[PDB]
Design a binder for this molecule. Structure first.
Ligand SMILES: [Br-]
Ligand SMILES: [Zn+2]
Length: 258
């Protein structure tokens, strides 16, 4: 039927409907820290989120998205390996049924419990659907989540999950500041890739933060309580909504640190 993460519709099946799945700049990939080239020409990232406006949280049946107002340059990313300004449109996570699995990216093959993704489109294209159709369309900043100490800043998110339990639910979600989700350090790896869920377009410049942030077991647990299914359908827990690592092929990973 339609794509998902189950046995019969899992990532191993996406190629049939989205041939791009076997393309050349597919994501995620394994980051090999010894083969990554430190490039001293990469500039520091620029995260301007002091003017962020969250609007809604929504369960889409594949993850939950926190959406922002992108009608104006309010929450932008610039700097790093990027040209022009990338506007914040939404953030969502990928996670697993267990703590030692959940992340999409991997580091020297180590998997983290979740991978937060912040998505931004290149303003040069006028709108997100136009950005997706360009090689330098989007910028995705990725951050790993390790189970440890709680993260105050993620708690407002955890708390509303109860109201968007099933596919199609949404809830007003204003005044959230995504600055609470950032690690102390902004060192990263960069490579040219794609969206990790269909349509798997190769329009992304990935920026993966070296340092992860901590979440308590309890916080992660509440992620594990959402459903894939719509209300009135048999319960399918939302878990393991991560794609496996893809072959790097003709690409280089560049670091912003030594
Ligand atoms: Br993604
Ligand atoms: Zn994602």
């Amino acid at each position: 039927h339609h794509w998902g993460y189950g046995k019969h519709n899992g990532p191993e099946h996406w190629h049939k409907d989205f041939p791009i799945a076997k393309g050349e700049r597919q994501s995620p990939v394994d980051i090999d820290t010894h083969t990554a080239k430190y490039d001293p020409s990469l500039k520091p990232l620029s995260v301007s989120y002091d003017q962020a406006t969250s609007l809604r949280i929504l369960n889409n049946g594949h993850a939950f998205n926190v959406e922002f107002d992108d009608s104006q340059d309010k929450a932008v990313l610039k700097g790093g390996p990027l040209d022009g300004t990338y506007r914040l449109i939404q953030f969502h996570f990928h996670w697993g049924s267990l703590d030692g699995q959940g992340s999409e990216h991997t580091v020297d093959k180590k998997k983290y419990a979740a991978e937060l993704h912040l998505v931004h489109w290149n303003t040069k294209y006028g709108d997100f659907g136009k950005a997706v159709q360009q090689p330098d369309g989007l910028a995705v900043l990725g951050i790993f989540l390790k189970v440890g100490s709680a993260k105050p800043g993620l708690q407002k998110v955890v708390d509303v999950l109860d109201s968007i339990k099933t596919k199609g639910k949404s809830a007003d979600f204003t005044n959230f500041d995504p600055r609470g989700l950032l690690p102390e350090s902004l060192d990263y790896w960069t490579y040219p890739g794609s969206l990790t869920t269909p349509p798997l377009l190769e329009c992304v410049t990935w920026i993966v933060l070296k340092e992860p942030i901590s979440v308590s077991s309890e916080q992660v647990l509440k992620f594990r309580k959402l459903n894939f299914n719509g209300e009135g359908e048999p319960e399918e827990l939302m878990v393991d909504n991560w794609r496996p690592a893809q072959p790097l092929k003709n690409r280089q990973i560049k670091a912003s640190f030594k």
